[PDB]
Ligand binder design. Structure first.
Ligand SMILES: NC(=O)c1ccc[n+]([C@@H]2O[C@H](COP(=O)([O-])OP(=O)(O)OC[C@H]3O[C@@H](n4cnc5c(N)ncnc54)[C@H](O)[C@@H]3O)[C@@H](O)[C@H]2O)c1
Lengths: 311, 480
């Protein structure tokens, strides 16, 4: 009858686990081999994936026809009548038409993530699921959603390679009828203040706040910033004590934030408040702000409290 | 060879019979602890315990203990729940994952909601991690349900073992997901939760797997904008520049060819961070496979020619050094970086460029014809077909793909007066290949408003009419 090749097409083009398992069991209970599922990233294919795809659909005669010509997945998607007829030894037009039917089945089930920027395959599939085969016809020419109103029929015939004029008319009609200084700076400690500062940056960029992280480069970062968040890790003011030469980075950032007069919001994670008489005179004003204790299990209300205490 | 199998089969027979027979409150947990310690003895055998652990997982599956574990994951007692989860974590092999995808989806998904204790979460993160490696259907069923939200919530913790499983889960979900899984991850901002995992200076493997997940998500062209707006790509390039692949190759036993084929399109996806991640991982795993005698896998796949393209077309020192080290640890020669001044080429630079990209058959075809860099940039179909003996149109099309890659990376300083290459690159980076098409005809910025389509077809040699229409439109709309 010919159901074995249909079961091989079910295995090699499976999107469901149940029918693939049943087809593999049906081919295992028979006396032939089971095929492997193909890699869907067709423009990411090398030669061996093309050889395997030939061996799984019944083109074992022309496998050595493609190995000598070095046809990869980029050349398989861009193959025409003349290169099949002359270069590949596929003289029969019926064999070429069977190869184009299998190429239609391949270019329907493909992953164009490495080439398509504007999601053109879903735009072709929303009209008719037999249009996605021309996705490589339009992505490789440089097109996206913002150019198809300036494409003609000759550009679809010659460049895109759409041989059916009905599909060209439908694509042209459906293309012409329905297509047309940071804010929060975070100072932290290198030893134990990295993860808390990264977590604060993520929870503030979830709400749409431009947050900078990481003297000729940081002063302009503080001056452009609207706010200031001080991460108080255990030992965040260890190197700042007895620093009467202004060489520590956290000391420079605290002195710059006090010179700016911004809304300094301390974030305390198990760090007690130091004494005012042990800090230098250019950083004694940081102890009078409204600090916020950090909780590792109720972070949403804490980030909302930080948002209520910032501009 | 067959000693550990015969020592470990009847002990697990007795242990699974004790698990199936007894139904107590703490003796069942003690039996789970016995099976889990025997699994820990199984995986920790040097060069023996791989097939031994695979056979013991097959014995646990064929006995019926996997459905027993799926029943004990629904137990109301917390202790036997965490021991059954930690036992189910270590047995997720490629034959067990089909059975778990048949039944266990929905039981593990139920435990994905309970997120407060650490003893559940540290194992359920690894279970979801290994379940992302099954197929695209299981990835769709986990991301569409509350399986992705468990990992995106568990990225907030400070457990150094749990965040490794979260980073590997997001990486394996980005590898085996497809288009829609990556869309549902990035629209739910899965790349932003990898920022505390790629920056945390506690571990060094964890940042590498986080940057692997970022680099795999950074290859989809509908995704890279929100990834650049996330800010996690900028942590990728210094981290690769500050580590050594040999130490992490000694730290990690490699990966199979099915997973080796996943790192290859990271290099041809023309992004700097993805190329650095792929070059680093393939250099480390090339050191691993070159310690053994299986160096033909990289030639079976084809990553060696991609590394040669990385060396010959390098604009970064880190990925070039990693690709040269990866080609040095293999058994072939390293190529030289090409001279970018292509119209300043003599014959020997053309011969070297042929030898570095795989056109060694036609080298004597160009030496007799005396083709320099000026003739290489002005070469067509007919001169390839008749004068050069390149009869096959597929070989000609491969030569035009390599010519596209060459005319993208070129120095036109000796011919271009009005900086026309940047004008072509501001529209589309695949337009700069026609720079020599327009400079050699005498054009500059002050003439393109008087050029027609026939002058671009015949003289400039632009074969695609879409590119001709775009060049004519952008030359007539914004130059005057
Ligand atoms: N130390 C441990 O605790 C430990 C170690 C490894 C695995 N595990 C468990 O094993 C399960 C996952 O393992 P997996 O097998 O499914 O991983 P996998 O299939 O996702 O990755 C492939 C692994 O198999 C090996 N491999 C496959 N084919 C190979 C080939 N042809 N040549 C050489 N090597 C090849 C690779 O070395 C690689 O390690 C999980 O439950 C995990 O917890 C535990």
């Amino acid at each position: 009858i010919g159901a074995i090749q249909s079961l091989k097409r079910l295995v090699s083009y499976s999107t469901n686990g149940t029918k693939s398992a049943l087809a593999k069991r049906a081919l295992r209970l028979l006396g032939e081999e089971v095929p492997r599922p193909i890699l869907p990233s067709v423009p990411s294919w090398k030669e061996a994936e093309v050889q395997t795809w030939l061996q799984q659909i019944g083109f074992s005669k022309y496998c050595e026809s493609f190995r000598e010509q070095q046809v990869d997945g980029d050349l398989l998607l861009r193959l025409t009548e003349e290169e099949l007829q002359t270069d590949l030894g596929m003289k029969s037009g019926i064999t070429r038409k069977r190869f184009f039917r299998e190429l239609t089945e391949l270019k329907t089930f493909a992953n164009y993530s490495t080439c398509d920027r504007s999601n053109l395959a879903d735009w072709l599939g929303s009209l008719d699921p037999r249009f996605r085969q021309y996705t490589y016809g339009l992505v490789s020419c440089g097109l996206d959603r913002s150019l198809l109103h300036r494409v003609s029929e000759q550009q679809l015939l010659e460049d895109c390679g759409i041989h059916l004029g009905v599909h060209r008319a439908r694509i042209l009609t459906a293309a012409r009828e329905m297509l047309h200084t940071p804010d929060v700076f975070i100072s932290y400690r290198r030893n134990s203040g990295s993860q808390l500062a990264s977590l604060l940056k993520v929870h503030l960029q979830l709400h749409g706040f431009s947050v900078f992280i990481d003297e000729d480069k940081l002063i302009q970062s503080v001056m452009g910033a609207r706010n200031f968040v001080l991460v108080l890790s255990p030992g965040a003011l260890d190197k700042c004590m007895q620093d009467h030469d202004c060489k520590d980075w956290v000391h420079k950032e605290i002195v710059t934030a006090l010179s700016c007069g911004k809304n300094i919001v301390p974030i305390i994670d198990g760090f007690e408040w130091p004494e005012p008489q042990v800090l230098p005179e250019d950083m004694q004003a940081v102890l009078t702000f409204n600090g916020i204790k950090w909780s590792h299990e109720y972070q949403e209300a804490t980030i909302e409290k930080i948002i209520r205490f910032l501009q | 060879v067959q000693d550990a199998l015969e020592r470990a089969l009847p002990e697990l027979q007795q242990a699974l019979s004790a698990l199936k027979q007894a139904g107590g409150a703490r003796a069942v947990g003690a039996g789970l602890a016995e099976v889990f310690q025997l699994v820990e003895e199984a995986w920790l055998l040097p060069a023996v315990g791989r097939e031994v652990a695979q056979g013991l997982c097959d014995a646990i599956r064929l006995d019926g203990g996997l459905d027993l574990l799926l029943r004990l994951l629904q137990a109301p007692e917390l202790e036997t729940r965490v021991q059954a989860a930690r036992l189910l974590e270590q047995i997720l092999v490629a034959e067990n994952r089909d059975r778990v995808a048949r039944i266990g989806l929905g039981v593990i998904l139920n435990l994905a909601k309970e997120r407060e204790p650490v003893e559940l979460a540290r194992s359920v993160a690894g279970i979801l991690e290994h379940m992302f490696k099954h197929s695209e259907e299981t990835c769709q069923r986990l991301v569409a349900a509350g399986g992705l939200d468990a990992v995106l919530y568990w990225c907030r913790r400070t457990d150094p073992a749990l965040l490794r499983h979260c980073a590997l889960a997001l990486g394996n979900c980005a590898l085996h997901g497809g288009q829609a899984v990556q869309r549902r991850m990035v629209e739910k901002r899965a790349a932003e939760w990898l920022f505390p995992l790629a920056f945390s200076k506690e571990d060094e493997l964890l940042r590498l797997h986080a940057c692997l997940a970022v680099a795999v998500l950074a290859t989809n062209k509908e995704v890279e904008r929100e990834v650049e707006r996330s800010g996690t790509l900028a942590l990728v390039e210094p981290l690769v520049a500050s580590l050594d692949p040999g130490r992490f190759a000694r730290c990690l036993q490699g990966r199979g060819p099915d997973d080796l084929q996943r790192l290859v399109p990271l290099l041809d996806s023309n992004r700097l961070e993805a190329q650095c991640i792929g070059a680093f991982y393939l250099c480390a795993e090339a050191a691993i496979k070159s310690l053994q005698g299986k160096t033909k896998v990289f030639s079976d796949i084809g990553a060696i020619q991609s590394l040669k393209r990385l060396v010959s077309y390098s604009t970064n020192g880190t990925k070039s050094a990693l690709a040269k080290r990866a080609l040095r640890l293999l058994g072939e020669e390293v190529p030289r970086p090409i001279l970018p001044s292509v119209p300043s080429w003599k014959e020997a630079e053309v011969q070297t460029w042929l030898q570095q990209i795989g056109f060694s058959k036609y080298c004597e075809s160009f030496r007799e014809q005396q083709v320099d860099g000026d003739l290489l940039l002005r070469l067509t179909e007919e001169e390839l077909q008749t004068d050069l003996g390149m009869k096959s149109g597929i070989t000609r099309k491969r030569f035009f793909r390599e010519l596209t890659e060459l005319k993208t990376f070129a120095n036109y300083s000796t011919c271009d007066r009005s900086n026309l290459a940047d004008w072509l690159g501001s529209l589309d980076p695949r337009f700069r290949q026609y720079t020599y098409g327009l400079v050699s005809c005498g054009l500059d910025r002050s003439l393109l408003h008087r050029v027609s389509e026939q002058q671009l077809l015949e003289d400039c040699g632009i074969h695609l009419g879409v590119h001709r229409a775009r060049i004519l439109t952008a030359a007539r709309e914004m130059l005057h």
